[PDB]
Design a protein around this nucleic acid. Structure first.
Lengths: 305, 333, 108, 293
RNA sequence: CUAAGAAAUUCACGGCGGGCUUGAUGUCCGCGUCUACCUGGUUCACUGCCGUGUAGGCAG
């Protein structure tokens, strides 16, 4: 929740065969929890040796192509699958449906540690950029740069050092390389007040969500209502439905050192706003905070406006 | 009885395209072979002289303004330097039949309008308007900016009978002022000729040639065309001048606008001079609208008063409604 | 605001995957008014190529944005009887000035 | 209140183009067969004004008519602004008719400032000024060589007559027409330089010449007291007093000594400035332009 | 330490045969685009030269 000292920009990042579905009720862009977990894994790989911290992300989505098809005059979509290898016999028995997507994302990470205190500026960015090219960001591999016009522009932009007009010039210089993207930010307060708006009959949050992202057509007693923005439903963290357990208690855990919980997704609201329409870039960083007393394990973006 | 839904009048006294030519004074009596002033392009580099936002403290943009000067290409028209006078030659036919519309819907409105103009030309003939039209032909008011700062400008008006020349009037545009309508002797015959044309008895085609001695190689001012923004940093991107095939020329509506400065009867002023007969009688070169529709002196107001309710207006502004029926236009809602 | 953002997004998407921007047959107006969607430096650039190859400002862009704002909303001679139309006109002027200040730094 | 939303002034002191010609010295009375300077295309593309071998001196013939009536604007929106501008210029010309302005314009007509590259290095530059009202001369004028200068202005024994002629023309009581030619010995085959278009030199038919706006700019070098200094000499009249050759725009808007700042409190706030700044505002009304918003 | 970790849609193919779209017509009336401007960025950080090598003096 701490404001960072620096916004280390990860560049144009083509990632292929991602997870499109990412939630039991959405199918579009992958979850932002994947991005916060990706930054925490990158921290566990490079930041302990670099003596820094890495907390937030800026999810911009320069381009996005799903592996879908619109089957033969229908208003829906279906998912392109992949043929799996055979069983002990030649059955092709099980076909579980999971989607894929190719997205060119570019993250901006909030640094906390000894960035300029004990280390240089370009070398830390070079190390983290050549470290993030040997891992996967959403369920699919991070494709490297082999095409022409070799960028490598890991801008390790300092934020708290400099005058105010120079700082605003640095923000509007970093926003120049976010040129065709679209930042994703949570709008929990917007969903709350939109729930209080239509609380006349029954104020269910899952009904205010499922009647806002659509196009609600309603004539004159002949129009559609004015689109307030690019509102999407996103997974906004998990919610436990079973108490805490011991490490070696629950059968077939991923590891027997950390406790287990049986959880369930929470569906929040999100917007794809242009990066020019934010004051500072550090306003749109995704952090995941947890309250282990109750069951809420929520990722969100504080200071989103 | 209501007005017509669409009402339209033809344009009487329609002038030609005023050509421009150059020559030597005292050869203007035989100026049938003079050459043409050509529209020649020239490059011009100007600095920035616009009224920017005042109290700007730093010169950080104003010192780079002159470092990035404004390059332009204008089109200018100058005389041959061995020629001191400018000859503007144009015809005008005075058609006649100034009361019959061309698109009137109602057969009950057009009869009242026709009998209204018929009683007008009966009791008070066109000789007032014809004397003021002959005044505007007498002084070279159609020489719009080629008249200011001129040593001597004389107007020659021929009446072309059957290709030949029936009658010729030689004038002096500096003696006949741009302000007073002075009833003279020689232009009264031209007034009777223009009134006999406007009356409809016999058509007349005047051929008007104005010579203005301005100076050897000075800057003449033809009309200025609209520039469509289809060009780069060269190629007349700033000011193009009107020109028929060779000569620089003045637009027909401009020389027809100078011909119809017939109302000194706008109520707000009495010493400003004459303005041109328009509905809501206005001037683009002053941003004003004399004969506003608030007071009952516009044109549509008094026209509906004369025709629909039979209120015969003041004699000084019975001339005005006819003077812009001769102009013609699109009247009625 | 959504119209201005969509225009900025289209201007960013146009001049990213089209490196062709130079002298050619039918590219006259694509150097002055094309200061926004303009290519990189050329191969045969001159010494003072900051005016004839790529001017360092959106010189024709501001008048085009003003004309687009005037054509997208049909403002009449009675569109400022209250502050509702005049406030939208002031917001359009401020958005045009902001877009001009943003596009001025594009050539650098 | 406020000024006019649109207001403009036509220019006065109308210049033509200046046809160049080459000839021999002591042939100044017979400049009617001096061949005009021809531009030829000879190769690297150069444009050199090759004067003939039998022709050393350059004569730049142009004309100038002054109009008068600098008070009345072309097209002013406000009806309450034209009358107060006319009253302002009327009280100006009634307290002191622009005779010192006409003296400085006469001094501009004394030295050939309309020659720019063809004035430096010249042995002697004699401007010959005619005055033609009917089609012939009325009282011609010959000018000296040491009285040429570039900054020394003084009441000369015959420049006062030229100045009172320019004042009588500019007053609005009978315009004048002056055929201003200038002979100057430059050098046989030395490249005299007229104006150039987008190399392409500017050319009227069968000759080379100088633009009218350049001669007008050279002829309205009146502005002396601008707040920076006055040591180098006088500059040309401009509302912001800008000069590209020196390279720094004078008469800055942080100071209220500019034209837009002096007229605005001259007519509205009635803050009449000194006689030199009133001369500057009036000389900025003899050049015209598009003022107001 | 990411609804994490994992994955071959393959083989083959005759679209094809026909055809009358046609008849008639009033685009009308009218107009003020104005005023000013130093291209003297270098229309190539140049051009033929004593020796194939940089070392130069005649409108340079």
């Amino acid at each position: 929740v701490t404001d960072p000292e620096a916004l280390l920009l990860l560049p144009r990042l083509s990632i292929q065969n991602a997870n499109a579905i990412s939630s039991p009720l959405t199918w579009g862009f992958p979850s932002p929890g994947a991005f916060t977990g990706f930054v925490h894994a990158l921290q566990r790989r490079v930041g302990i040796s670099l003596d820094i911290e890495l907390d937030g992300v800026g999810i911009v989505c320069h381009r996005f192509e799903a592996q879908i098809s619109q089957p033969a005059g229908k208003r829906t979509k279906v998912f392109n699958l992949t043929r799996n290898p055979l069983n002990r016999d030649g059955s092709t028995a099980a076909i579980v449906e999971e989607g894929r997507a190719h997205l060119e994302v570019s993250l901006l990470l909030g640094v906390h540690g000894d960035g300029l205190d004990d280390h240089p500026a370009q070398e830390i960015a070079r190390q983290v950029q050549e470290q993030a090219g040997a891992m996967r960001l959403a369920g699919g591999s991070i494709l490297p740069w082999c095409n022409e016009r070799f960028p490598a522009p890991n801008a390790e932009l300092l934020m708290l050092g400099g005058s105010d007009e120079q700082r605003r010039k640095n923000q509007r210089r970093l926003t120049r390389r976010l040129l065709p993207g679209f930042a994703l930010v949570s709008r929990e307060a917007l969903l709350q007040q939109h729930l209080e708006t239509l609380r006349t009959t029954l104020p269910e949050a899952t009904t205010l969500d499922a009647l806002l992202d659509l196009c609600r057509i309603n004539f004159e007693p002949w129009q559609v209502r004015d689109k307030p923005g690019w509102l999407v439903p996103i997974p906004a963290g998990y919610n436990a439905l079973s108490p805490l357990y011991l490490p070696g208690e629950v059968r077939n855990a991923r590891d027997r050192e950390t406790p287990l919980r049986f959880v369930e997704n929470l569906f929040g609201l999100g917007e794809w706003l242009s990066p020019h329409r934010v004051a500072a870039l550090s306003d749109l960083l995704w952090y995941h905070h947890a309250e282990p007393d109750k069951g809420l394990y929520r990722w969100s973006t504080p200071r989103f406006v | 009885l209501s007005t017509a839904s669409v009402l339209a009048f033809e344009r009487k006294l329609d002038p030609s395209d005023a050509l421009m030519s150059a020559g030597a004074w005292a050869q203007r009596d035989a100026s049938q072979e003079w050459p043409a002033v050509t529209v020649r392009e020239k490059s011009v580099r100007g600095t920035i002289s616009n009224r920017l936002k005042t109290k700007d403290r730093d010169p950080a943009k104003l010192d780079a303004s002159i470092q990035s000067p404004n390059l332009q290409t204008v089109d200018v028209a100058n005389l041959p330097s061995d020629a001191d006078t400018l000859k503007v030659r144009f015809t005008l036919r005075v058609l006649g039949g100034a009361g019959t519309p061309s698109a009137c819907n109602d057969a009950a409105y057009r009869d009242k309008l026709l009998q209204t103009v018929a009683t007008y030309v009966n009791e008070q003939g066109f000789a007032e308007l014809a004397r003021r039209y002959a005044h505007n032909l007498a002084n070279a008011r159609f020489l719009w900016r080629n008249r200011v700062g001129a040593e001597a400008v004389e107007v020659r008006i021929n009446h072309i009978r059957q290709g030949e020349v029936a009658r010729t009037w030689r004038f002096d545009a500096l003696a006949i002022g741009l302000r007073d309508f002075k009833a003279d002797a020689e232009l009264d015959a031209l007034a009777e000729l223009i009134a006999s044309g406007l009356s409809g008895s016999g058509h007349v085609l005047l051929e008007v040639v104005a010579f203005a001695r301005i100076g050897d190689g000075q800057e003449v001012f033809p009309s200025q065309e609209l520039i469509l923004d289809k060009g780069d940093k060269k190629g007349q991107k700033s000011k193009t001048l009107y020109s028929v095939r060779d000569a620089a020329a003045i637009h027909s509506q401009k020389i027809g606008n100078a011909l119809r400065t017939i109302d000194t009867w706008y109520p707000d002023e009495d010493g400003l001079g004459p303005i041109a007969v328009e509905p809501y009688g206005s001037v683009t070169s002053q941003g004003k609208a004399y004969r506003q529709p608030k007071q009952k002196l516009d044109f549509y107001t008094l026209l509906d008063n004369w025709v629909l309710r039979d209120e015969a207006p003041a004699v000084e502004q019975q001339h005005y409604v006819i003077a812009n029926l001769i102009r013609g236009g699109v009247f009625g809602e | 605001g959504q119209i201005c953002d969509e225009a900025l997004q289209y201007a960013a998407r146009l001049r990213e995957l089209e490196p062709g921007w130079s002298a050619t047959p039918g590219c006259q107006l694509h150097d002055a008014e094309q200061l926004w969607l303009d290519p990189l430096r050329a191969q045969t650039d001159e010494t003072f190529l900051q005016r004839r190859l790529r001017g360092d400002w959106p010189a024709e862009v501001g008048n085009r944005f003003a004309n687009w704002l005037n054509r997208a909303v049909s403002s009449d001679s009675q569109i400022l009887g209250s502050p509702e139309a005049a406030q939208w006109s002031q917001e359009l002027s401020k958005e045009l000035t902001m877009f001009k200040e943003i596009l001025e730094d594009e050539r650098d």
